[PDB]
Amino acid sequence: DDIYKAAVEQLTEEQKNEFKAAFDIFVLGAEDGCISTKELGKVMRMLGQNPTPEELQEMIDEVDEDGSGTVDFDEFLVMMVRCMKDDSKGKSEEELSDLFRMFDKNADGYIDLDELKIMLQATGETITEDDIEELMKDGDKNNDGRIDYDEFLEFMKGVE
């Protein structure tokens, strides 16, 4: 969600209007105001095609975080637009481990809260204790208030 907003902070909206133009060219292919399973089929066999069905049924059932249950119009749009590659730095293992050192300042492989709190406070931007609640759910996959590294990894892998 948030990512949507940052990327739109990159560029402006007139762009989006001409996108809409491109799409009047495309938007043939909603069965349900959505672009769902049969629409995936329809607009993709438009050229006799469909995504690698891992992608396809993935969109059907899985990437529904919300309980959308289906490929919405939004979800087929999601695949078709996440096409062009732009993510930054996706930070991960060796990063996240050297980080985990001061994360688990404990020197133990099990972070405590306030080392992470310090890192949060000293990032350069906003720490919602909502998001800290998120992170306790996430980071400590054990959720025992103390995090083995890989837990923190998948908690922090793959993001700017």
Partner: peptide, 12 residues
């Protein structure tokens, strides 16, 4: 993408 689109990809 570009292989399927052409020159419409210039600002990015």
């Amino acid at each position: 993408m570009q292989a399927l689109l052409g020159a419409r990809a210039k600002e990015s």
